CSV table of C-alpha atoms in Angstrom, one decimal:
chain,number,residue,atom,x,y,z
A,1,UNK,CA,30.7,48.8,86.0
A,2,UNK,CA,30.4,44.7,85.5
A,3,UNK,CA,27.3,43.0,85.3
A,4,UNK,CA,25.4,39.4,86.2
A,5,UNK,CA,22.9,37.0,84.7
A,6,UNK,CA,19.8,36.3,86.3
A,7,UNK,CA,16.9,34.1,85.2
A,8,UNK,CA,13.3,36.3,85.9
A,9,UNK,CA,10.6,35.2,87.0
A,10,UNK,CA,7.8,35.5,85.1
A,11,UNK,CA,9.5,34.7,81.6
A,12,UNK,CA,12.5,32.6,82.5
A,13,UNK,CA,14.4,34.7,80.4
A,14,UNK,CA,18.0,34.7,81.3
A,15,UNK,CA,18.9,38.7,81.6
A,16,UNK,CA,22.3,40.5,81.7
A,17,UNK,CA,21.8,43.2,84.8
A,18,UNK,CA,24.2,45.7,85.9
A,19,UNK,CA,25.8,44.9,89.0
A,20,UNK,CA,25.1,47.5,92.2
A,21,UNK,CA,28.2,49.1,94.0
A,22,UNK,CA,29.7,48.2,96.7
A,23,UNK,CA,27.7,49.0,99.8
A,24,UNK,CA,24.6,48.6,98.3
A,25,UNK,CA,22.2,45.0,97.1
A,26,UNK,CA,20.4,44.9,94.2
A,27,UNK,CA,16.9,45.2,95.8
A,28,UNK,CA,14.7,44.5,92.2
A,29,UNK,CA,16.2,42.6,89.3
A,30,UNK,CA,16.0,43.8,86.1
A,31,UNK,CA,13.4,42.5,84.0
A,32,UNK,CA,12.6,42.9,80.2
A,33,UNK,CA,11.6,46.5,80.6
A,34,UNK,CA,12.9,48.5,83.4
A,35,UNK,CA,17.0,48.2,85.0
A,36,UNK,CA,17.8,47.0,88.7
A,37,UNK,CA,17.3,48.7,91.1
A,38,UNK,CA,20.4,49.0,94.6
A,39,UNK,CA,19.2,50.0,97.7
A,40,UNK,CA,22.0,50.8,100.2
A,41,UNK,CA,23.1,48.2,102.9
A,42,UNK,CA,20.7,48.6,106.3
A,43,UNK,CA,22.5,49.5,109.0
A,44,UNK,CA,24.3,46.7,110.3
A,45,UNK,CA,25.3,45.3,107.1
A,46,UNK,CA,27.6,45.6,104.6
A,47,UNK,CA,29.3,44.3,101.0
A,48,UNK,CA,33.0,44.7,99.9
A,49,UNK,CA,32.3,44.9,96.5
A,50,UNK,CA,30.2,45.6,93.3
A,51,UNK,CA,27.9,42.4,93.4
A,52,UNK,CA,24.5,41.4,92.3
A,53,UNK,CA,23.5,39.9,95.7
A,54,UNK,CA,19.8,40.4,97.1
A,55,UNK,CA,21.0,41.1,101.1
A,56,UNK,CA,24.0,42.9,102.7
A,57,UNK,CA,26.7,40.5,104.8
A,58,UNK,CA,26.2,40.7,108.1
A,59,UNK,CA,28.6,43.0,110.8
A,60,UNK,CA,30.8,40.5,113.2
A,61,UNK,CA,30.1,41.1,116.9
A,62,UNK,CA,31.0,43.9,118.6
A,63,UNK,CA,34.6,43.8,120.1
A,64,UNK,CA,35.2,42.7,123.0
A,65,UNK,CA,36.8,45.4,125.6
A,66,UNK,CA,39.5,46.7,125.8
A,67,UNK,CA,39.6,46.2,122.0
A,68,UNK,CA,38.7,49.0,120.0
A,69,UNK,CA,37.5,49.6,116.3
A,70,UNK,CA,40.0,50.0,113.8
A,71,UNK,CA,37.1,49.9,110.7
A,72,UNK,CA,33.5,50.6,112.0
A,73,UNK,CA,30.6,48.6,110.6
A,74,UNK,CA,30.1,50.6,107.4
A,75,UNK,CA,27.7,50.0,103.9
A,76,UNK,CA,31.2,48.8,102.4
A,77,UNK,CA,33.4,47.1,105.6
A,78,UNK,CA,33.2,44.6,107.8
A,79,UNK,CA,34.0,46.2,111.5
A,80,UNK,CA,37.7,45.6,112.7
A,81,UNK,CA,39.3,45.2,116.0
A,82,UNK,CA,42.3,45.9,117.2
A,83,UNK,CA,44.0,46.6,120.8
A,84,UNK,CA,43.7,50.4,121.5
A,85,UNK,CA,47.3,52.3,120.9
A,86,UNK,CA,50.1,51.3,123.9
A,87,UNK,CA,48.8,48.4,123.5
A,88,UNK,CA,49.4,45.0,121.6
A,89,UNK,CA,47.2,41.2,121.2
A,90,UNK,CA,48.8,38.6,123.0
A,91,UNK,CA,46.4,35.1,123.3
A,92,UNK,CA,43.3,36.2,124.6
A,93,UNK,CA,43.2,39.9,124.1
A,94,UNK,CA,45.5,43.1,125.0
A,95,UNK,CA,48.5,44.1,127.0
A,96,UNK,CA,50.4,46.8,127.5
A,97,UNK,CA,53.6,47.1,126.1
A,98,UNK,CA,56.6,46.9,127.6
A,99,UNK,CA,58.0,50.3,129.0
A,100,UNK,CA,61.6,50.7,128.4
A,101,UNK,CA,63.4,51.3,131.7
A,102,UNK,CA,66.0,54.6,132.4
A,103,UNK,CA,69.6,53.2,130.2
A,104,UNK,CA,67.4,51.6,127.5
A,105,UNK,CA,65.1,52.9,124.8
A,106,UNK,CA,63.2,51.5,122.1
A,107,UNK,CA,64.9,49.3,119.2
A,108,UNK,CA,61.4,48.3,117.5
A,109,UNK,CA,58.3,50.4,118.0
A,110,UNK,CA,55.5,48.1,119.7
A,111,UNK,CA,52.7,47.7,117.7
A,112,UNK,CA,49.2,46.3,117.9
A,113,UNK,CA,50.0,42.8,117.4
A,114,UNK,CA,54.5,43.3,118.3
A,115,UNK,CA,55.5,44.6,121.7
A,116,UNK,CA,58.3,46.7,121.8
A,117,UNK,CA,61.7,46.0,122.2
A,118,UNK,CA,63.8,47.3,124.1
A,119,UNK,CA,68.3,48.0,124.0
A,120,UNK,CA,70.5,49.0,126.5
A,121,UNK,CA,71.6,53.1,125.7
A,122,UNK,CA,74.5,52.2,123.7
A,123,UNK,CA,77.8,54.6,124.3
A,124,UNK,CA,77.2,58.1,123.4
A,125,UNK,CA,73.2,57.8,123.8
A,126,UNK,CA,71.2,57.8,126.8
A,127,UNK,CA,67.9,57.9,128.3
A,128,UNK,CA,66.3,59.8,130.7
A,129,UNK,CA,63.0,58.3,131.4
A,130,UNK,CA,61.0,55.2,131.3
A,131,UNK,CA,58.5,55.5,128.5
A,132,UNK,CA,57.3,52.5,125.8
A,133,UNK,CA,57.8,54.9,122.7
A,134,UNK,CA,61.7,57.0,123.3
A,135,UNK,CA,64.8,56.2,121.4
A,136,UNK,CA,67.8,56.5,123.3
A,137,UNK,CA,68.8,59.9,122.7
A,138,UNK,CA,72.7,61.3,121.5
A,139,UNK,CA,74.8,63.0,124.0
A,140,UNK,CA,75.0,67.0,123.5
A,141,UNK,CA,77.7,67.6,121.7
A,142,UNK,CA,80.0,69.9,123.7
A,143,UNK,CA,82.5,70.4,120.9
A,144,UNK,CA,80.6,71.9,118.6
A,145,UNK,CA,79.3,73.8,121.6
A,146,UNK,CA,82.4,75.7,122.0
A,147,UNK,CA,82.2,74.0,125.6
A,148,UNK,CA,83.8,70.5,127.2
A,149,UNK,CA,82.7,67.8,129.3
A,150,UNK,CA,82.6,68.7,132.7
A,151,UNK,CA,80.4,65.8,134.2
A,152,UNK,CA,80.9,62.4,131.2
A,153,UNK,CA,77.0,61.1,130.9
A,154,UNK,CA,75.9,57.7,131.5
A,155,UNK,CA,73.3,55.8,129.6
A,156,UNK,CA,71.0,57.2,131.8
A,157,UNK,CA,71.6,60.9,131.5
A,158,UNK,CA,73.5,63.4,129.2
A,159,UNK,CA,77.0,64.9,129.9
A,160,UNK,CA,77.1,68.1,131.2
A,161,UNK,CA,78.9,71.3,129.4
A,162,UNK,CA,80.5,74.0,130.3
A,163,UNK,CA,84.4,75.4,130.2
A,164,UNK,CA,87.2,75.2,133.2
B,1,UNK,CA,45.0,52.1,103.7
B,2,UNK,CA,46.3,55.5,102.9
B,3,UNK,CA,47.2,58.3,105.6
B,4,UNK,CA,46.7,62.2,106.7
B,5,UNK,CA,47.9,64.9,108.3
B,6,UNK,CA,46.5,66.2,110.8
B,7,UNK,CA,47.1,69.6,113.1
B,8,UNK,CA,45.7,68.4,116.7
B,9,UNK,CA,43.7,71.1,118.4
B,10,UNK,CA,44.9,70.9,122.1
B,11,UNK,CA,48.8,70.2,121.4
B,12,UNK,CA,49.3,72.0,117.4
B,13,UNK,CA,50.9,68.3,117.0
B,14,UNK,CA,51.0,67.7,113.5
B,15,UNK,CA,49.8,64.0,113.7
B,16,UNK,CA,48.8,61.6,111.0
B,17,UNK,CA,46.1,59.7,110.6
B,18,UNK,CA,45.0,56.8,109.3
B,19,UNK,CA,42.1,57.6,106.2
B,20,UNK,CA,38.3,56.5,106.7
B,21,UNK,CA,37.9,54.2,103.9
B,22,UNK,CA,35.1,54.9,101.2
B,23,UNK,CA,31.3,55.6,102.3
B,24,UNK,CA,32.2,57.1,105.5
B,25,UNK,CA,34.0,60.0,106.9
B,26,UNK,CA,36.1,60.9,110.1
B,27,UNK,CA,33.8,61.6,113.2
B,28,UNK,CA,36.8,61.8,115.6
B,29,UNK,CA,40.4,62.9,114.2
B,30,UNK,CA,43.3,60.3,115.6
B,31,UNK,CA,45.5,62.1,118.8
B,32,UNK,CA,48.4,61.4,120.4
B,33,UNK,CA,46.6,58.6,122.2
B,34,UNK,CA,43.8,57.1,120.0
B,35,UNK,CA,42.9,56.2,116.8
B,36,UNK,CA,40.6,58.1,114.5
B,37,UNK,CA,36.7,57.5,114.2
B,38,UNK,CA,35.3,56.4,111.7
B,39,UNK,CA,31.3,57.1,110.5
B,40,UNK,CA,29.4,56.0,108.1
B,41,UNK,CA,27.6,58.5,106.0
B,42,UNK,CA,24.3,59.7,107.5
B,43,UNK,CA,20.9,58.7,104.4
B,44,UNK,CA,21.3,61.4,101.6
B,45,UNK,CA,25.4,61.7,101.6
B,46,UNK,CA,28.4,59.7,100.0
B,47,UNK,CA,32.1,59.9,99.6
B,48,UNK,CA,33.5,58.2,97.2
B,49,UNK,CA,36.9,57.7,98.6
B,50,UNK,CA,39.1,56.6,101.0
B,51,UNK,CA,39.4,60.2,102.5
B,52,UNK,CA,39.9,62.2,105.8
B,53,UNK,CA,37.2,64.2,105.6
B,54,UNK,CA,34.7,65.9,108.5
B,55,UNK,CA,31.4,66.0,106.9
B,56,UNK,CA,29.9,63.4,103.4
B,57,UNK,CA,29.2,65.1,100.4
B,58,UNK,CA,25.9,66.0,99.6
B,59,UNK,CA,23.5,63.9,96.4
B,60,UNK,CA,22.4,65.7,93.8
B,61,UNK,CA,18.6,66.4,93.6
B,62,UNK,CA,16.7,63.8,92.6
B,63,UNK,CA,16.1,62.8,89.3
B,64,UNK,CA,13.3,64.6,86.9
B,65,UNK,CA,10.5,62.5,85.9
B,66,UNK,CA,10.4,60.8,83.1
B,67,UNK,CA,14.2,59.8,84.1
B,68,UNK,CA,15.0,57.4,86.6
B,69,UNK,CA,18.2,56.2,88.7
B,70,UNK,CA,21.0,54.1,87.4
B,71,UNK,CA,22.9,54.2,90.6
B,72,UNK,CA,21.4,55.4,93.9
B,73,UNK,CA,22.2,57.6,96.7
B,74,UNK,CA,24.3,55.8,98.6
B,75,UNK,CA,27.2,55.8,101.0
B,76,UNK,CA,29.7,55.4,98.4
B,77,UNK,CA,28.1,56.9,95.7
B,78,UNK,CA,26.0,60.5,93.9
B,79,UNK,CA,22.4,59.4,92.5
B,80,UNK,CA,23.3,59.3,88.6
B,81,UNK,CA,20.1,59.7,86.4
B,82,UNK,CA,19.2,58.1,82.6
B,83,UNK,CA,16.2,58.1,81.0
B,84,UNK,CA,14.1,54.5,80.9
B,85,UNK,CA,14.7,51.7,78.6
B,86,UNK,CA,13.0,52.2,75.2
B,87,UNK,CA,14.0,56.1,76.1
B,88,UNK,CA,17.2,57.9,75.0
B,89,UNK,CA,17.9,61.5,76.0
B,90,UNK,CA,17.4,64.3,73.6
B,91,UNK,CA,18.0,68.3,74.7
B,92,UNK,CA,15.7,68.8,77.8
B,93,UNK,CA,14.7,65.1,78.4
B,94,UNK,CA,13.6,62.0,77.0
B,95,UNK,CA,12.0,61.0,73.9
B,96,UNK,CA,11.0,57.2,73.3
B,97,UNK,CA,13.4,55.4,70.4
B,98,UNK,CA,12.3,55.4,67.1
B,99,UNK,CA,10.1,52.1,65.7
B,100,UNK,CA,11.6,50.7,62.9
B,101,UNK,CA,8.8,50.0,60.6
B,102,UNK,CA,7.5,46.8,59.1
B,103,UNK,CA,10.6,46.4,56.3
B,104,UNK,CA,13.2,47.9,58.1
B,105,UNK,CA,15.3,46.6,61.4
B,106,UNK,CA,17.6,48.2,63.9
B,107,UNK,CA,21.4,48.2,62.5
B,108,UNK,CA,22.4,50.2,65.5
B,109,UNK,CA,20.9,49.4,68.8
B,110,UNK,CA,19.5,52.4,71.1
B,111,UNK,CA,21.1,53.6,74.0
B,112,UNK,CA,20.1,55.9,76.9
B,113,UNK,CA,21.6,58.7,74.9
B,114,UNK,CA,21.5,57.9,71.0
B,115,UNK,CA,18.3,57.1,69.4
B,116,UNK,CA,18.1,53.6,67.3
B,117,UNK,CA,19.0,53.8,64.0
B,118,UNK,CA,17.1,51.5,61.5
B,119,UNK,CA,17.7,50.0,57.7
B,120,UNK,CA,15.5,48.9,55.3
B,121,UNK,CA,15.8,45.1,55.3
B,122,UNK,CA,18.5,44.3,52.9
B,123,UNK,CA,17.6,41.5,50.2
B,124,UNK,CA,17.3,37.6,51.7
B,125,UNK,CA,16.2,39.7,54.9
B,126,UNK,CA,12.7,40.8,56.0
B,127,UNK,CA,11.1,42.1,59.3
B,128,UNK,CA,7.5,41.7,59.4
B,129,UNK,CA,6.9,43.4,63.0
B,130,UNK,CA,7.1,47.2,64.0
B,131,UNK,CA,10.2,47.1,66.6
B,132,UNK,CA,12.9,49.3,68.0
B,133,UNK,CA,14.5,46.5,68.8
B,134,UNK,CA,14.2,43.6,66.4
B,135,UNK,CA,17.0,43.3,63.6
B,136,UNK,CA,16.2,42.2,59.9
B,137,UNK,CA,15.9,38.0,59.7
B,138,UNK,CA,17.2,35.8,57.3
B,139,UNK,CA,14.6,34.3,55.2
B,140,UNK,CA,13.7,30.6,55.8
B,141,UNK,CA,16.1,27.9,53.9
B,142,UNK,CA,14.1,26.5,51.5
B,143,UNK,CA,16.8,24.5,49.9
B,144,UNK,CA,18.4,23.1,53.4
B,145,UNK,CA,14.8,22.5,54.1
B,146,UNK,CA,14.5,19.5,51.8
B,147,UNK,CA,11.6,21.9,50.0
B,148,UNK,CA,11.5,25.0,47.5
B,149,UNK,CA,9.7,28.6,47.2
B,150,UNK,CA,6.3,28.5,46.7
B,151,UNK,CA,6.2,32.5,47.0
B,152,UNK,CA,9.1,34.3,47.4
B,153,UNK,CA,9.7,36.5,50.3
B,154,UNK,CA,9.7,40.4,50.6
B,155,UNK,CA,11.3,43.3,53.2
B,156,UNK,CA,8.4,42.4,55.2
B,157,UNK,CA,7.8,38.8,54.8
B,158,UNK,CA,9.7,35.3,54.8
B,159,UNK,CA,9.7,33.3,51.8
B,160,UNK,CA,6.8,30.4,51.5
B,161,UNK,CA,8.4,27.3,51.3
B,162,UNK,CA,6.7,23.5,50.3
B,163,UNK,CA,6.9,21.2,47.3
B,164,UNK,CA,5.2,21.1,43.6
């Protein structure tokens, strides 16, 4: 564990202390005769790393709705927002992400900060149902089913199998 | 920031999770529809890790008299206990350093687990002070002094110097 120079007090000496861990301050220097001492952070406050500081860094506002914490305020964090999950920043704060219509399906999962975007069911897939999350999904395969193709699908819905 | 699995009660999804970072653990596992929860460790428990964990680990007991804490409980961190300066640790507890004696010095400083280890004050070097500390001087420069010795110097005293 690294360490600091401080100058005390009474003697001017210039000491070498320990540094505290993260998520604690040192709340007593070290003097001639006894070693710092940390105390943790106070609720509300927090540092990111070993330091020889005398007060904890103060925890940003709270985040404003509909964003959610990613990181709390913890001894060694700084709170963190983010859009809640199916949905993504844009300016101001959060929308939802785009919901992929029947015939298309997701290309690039949306994140908190991307959208989602979207590509038409190309030949052989399909899908079924709206949804911001679904791939277009593969036909059944009716060969190796031992079957054929008794309806053809459509990028909407699967072919159908069955023999005759 | 690292990652877990995780089985999720209502559906037996096998989800994963993002880890609660060091000093806090998971109050609320992620689910299909929200991120995980993280808490910081309630007075009297740590974790030292990032982790994914439901409940902090517990500190050790505290810290027998004459010893003292190096670190303290905190969020991150066990209570980890040394004897006090000037004290090293011998058996059951602590035992103050040895005091080198008037004509001796300290070649080997003390720590918080070896004792100090003294020498008698090698010739051109004295100590004139009982320390546990203090290492053997050099005796005053006479010559680079513009002066000479008017009584020469011992283990426990610097040489005299003046003129005539």
């Amino acid at each position: 564990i690294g360490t600091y120079r401080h100058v005390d007090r009474a003697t001017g000496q210039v000491l070498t202390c320990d540094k505290c861990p993260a998520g604690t301050y040192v709340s007593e220097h070290c003097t001639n005769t006894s070693l710092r001492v940390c105390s943790s952070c106070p609720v509300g406050t927090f540092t990111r790393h070993e330091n020889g500081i005398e007060k904890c860094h103060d925890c940003s506002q709270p985040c404003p709705w509909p964003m959610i914490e990613k990181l709390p305020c913890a001894a060694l964090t700084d709170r963190e927002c983010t859009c809640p999950p199916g949905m993504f920043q844009s300016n101001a704060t959060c929308a939802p992400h785009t919901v992929c219509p029947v015939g298309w399906g997701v290309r690039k999962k949306g994140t908190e900060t991307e959208d989602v975007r979207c590509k038409q069911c190309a030949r052989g897939t399909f899908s079924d149902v709206p949804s911001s999350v679904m791939k277009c999904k593969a036909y059944t395969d009716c060969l190796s089913q031992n079957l054929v193709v008794i309806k053809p699908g459509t990028k909407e819905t699967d072919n159908v199998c069955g023999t005759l």
